[PDB]
Amino acid sequence: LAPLPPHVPEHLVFDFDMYNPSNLSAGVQEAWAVLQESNVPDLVWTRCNGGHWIATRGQLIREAYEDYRHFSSECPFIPREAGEAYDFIPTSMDPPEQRQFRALANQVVGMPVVDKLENRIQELACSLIESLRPQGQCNFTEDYAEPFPIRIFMLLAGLPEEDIPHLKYLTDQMTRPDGSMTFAEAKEALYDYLIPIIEQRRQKPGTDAISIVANGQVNGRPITSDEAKRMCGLLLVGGLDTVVNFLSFSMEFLAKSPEHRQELIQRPERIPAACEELLRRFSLVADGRILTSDYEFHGVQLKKGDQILLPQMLSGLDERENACPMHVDFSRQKVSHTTFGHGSHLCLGQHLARREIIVTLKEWLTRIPDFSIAPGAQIQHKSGIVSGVQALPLVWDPATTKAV
Ligand code: HEM
Ligand SMILES: CC1(C)[C@@H]2CC[C@@]1(C)C(=O)C2
Ligand SMILES: [C-]#N
């Protein structure tokens, strides 16, 4: 716990640790939900991780992400040093500067790309699941959650699969550091990996994601090697962590809820809707912004330079946004959430994300309609910029499956 700033009132102190929440054993989302208990203020200050503010309700989370004139993405991560080393593009930029680079990235992961990858996405999912089907068991995180979205991304990026172990390790230290490496070191290592690749792809322009970025233009002029590295770096982290973790959260839930499995099996056309509801309930991201000047937010005096965590994960779990938030209802009328962010930085890979999610659910339930958490297993979650599932052992009776 760091020394409490002079301008922060004692009653707003709620020592929540984002990389190791106290009620984590009850489930990572539940651990964060504590910030929304009846007594907890809308905006509290935690002396943990160097010290920072934490907006706990969707109304404040949304407003902050919308007001980029006060809440700047220049320093988006906690701890401070990580937020200061963080220079990925376009996430470390604010409008209007951000807009030009965001258009180029949208060109490599946007919906048009999701359409080009449709077949490979479909093929890989079915292939991985069919290989697992006869086994009657699997380590979901290692056997599907990771390989499915990561191999698709490496394919798009035109990068050898043999590089996955290294890159996944680095991305992981940026979102849920184990301690061995600082954000800055992990970031430098990732950039080191990319520098030669970007240079080769600028000499021999190709069709892959790195070549498209590196040979691209930003609102009319040539992107720089430095800018390309900063953009590609972000893309790798984006393609290697969130979807991977989200899939495990969703499968864990379905593995524990026979009735929800029944519903999608009976009405597959509801899968897209179920995807959205799961995204709300199992939202998993939480980054933030930095104050550009002294500003009073919701009755609370914020100081220039202060860091504020705006958990994208919290908005959808807020009862003021969704009645009975911890409950999963695929028929929920108005599924409100900020799972893919809010404001001008709304996730660019959300379309690739939903496709991977929907395909996974459709193809998995198609072949392995019935499954459960392995006997006696206790699922462990992890927390950080991107929260996730440590391991997910599943089992099923091969006799109930079907090859398609
Ligand atoms: C379940 C999956 C995913 C979730 C929940 C998610 C969530 C988010 C969130 C919350 C942001 C904004 C953070 C901020 O405002 O500081 C974001 C940004 C971004 N995401 Fe994702 N994302 C997902 C999948 C992907 C995938 C598959 C990619 C593809 C590589 C990707 C690429 C990006 C990019 C490029 C940005 C930066 C946009 C900008 O700063 O303007 N995301 N994502
Ligand atoms: C917070 C994010 C999910 C968003 C894209 C990947 C991520 C970890 C970032 O650094 C920006
Ligand atoms: C976006 N990961």
Curated annotation (Swiss-Prot):
What CDD domains does the annotation carry?
Answer: P450cam-like
Catalytic activity as recorded in UniProt: 2 reduced [2Fe-2S]-[putidaredoxin] + (1R,4R)-camphor + O2 + 2 H(+) = (1R,4R,5R)-5-hydroxycamphor + 2 oxidized [2Fe-2S]-[putidaredoxin] + H2O
GO MF, one annotated term: iron ion binding
Q: Which cofactor does it need?
A: heme
Disulfide linkages recorded for this protein, renumbered to the chain, are: none
Q: Which GO terms describe its cellular component?
A: cytoplasm
Name the UniProt key words of this record, in alphabetical order: Cytoplasm, Heme, Iron, Metal-binding, Monooxygenase, Oxidoreductase
Provide the protein's localization. Answer: Cytoplasm
Query: Family, per the entry?
Result: Belongs to the cytochrome P450 family.
Q: Which PANTHER family match?
A: P450, PUTATIVE (EUROFUNG)-RELATED
Q: What is this protein called?
A: Camphor 5-monooxygenase
